[PDB]
Symmetry: C3
Subunit: 86 residues, 3 copies
């Protein structure tokens, strides 16, 4: 599970991307609930920040980043667009 950067520097990210790779790709300093083992995946993280099942169209925010749900894979996010804030 993957990360591709686009011709404006925004990221198209697979929802199943794991926390260590996600932090690397986005330069995150932390994730919410770190070390508590609540979720292990970008999709889970977004679900946690939303406090409910995400839907395509949903937007959340974390550190320097706007996270938009681009597509679902039933109970999980398939694809996310990550855009730098500013």
């Amino acid at each position: 599970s993957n990360a591709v950067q686009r011709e404006d520097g925004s990221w198209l990210l697979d929802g199943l991307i794991a926390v260590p790779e996600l932090k690397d790709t986005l330069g995150l300093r932390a994730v919410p609930e770190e070390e508590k083992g609540v979720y292990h995946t970008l999709s889970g993280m977004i679900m946690w920040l939303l406090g409910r099942l995400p839907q395509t169209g949903d937007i959340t925010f974390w550190e320097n980043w706007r996270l938009e749900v681009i597509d679902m894979d039933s109970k999980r996010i398939d694809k996310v667009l990550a855009t730098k804030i500013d």
Copy 2:
């Protein structure tokens, strides 16, 4: 149930604007909980996204839009400013 486009592209919308007219106005692909008979107006969609009673000053997000609650009629939203994020 009006909408009115300001000088800068942004939209002033009635909170009782129905979902059909809302998709058409803002070019929304979808709405949350579509076909689940959960809300029928922009006011109810904003309330769903916030997961609580809206207040004037509240900001929510969906697709390419920032939706700001500009005015209330007691419990229901009366005016909403929609702005397209980039």
Copy 3:
């Protein structure tokens, strides 16, 4: 307690800044739950808007402001960056 403006015009705010100073500093029309006595500081306000204990990295929104949690002091927010959205 206090508020310092960066050269870019954004504000670093102490989490314990009280409602009157906050409104004056950011030119707020209101704050949520005004005169309900729910919270009395910026930290309490953001905790109210998130619906849970804030974490460093969280972002919330009110009126024309993006509110980023910069640092925590255990149960309370220590520092916030407020940036005018437009």
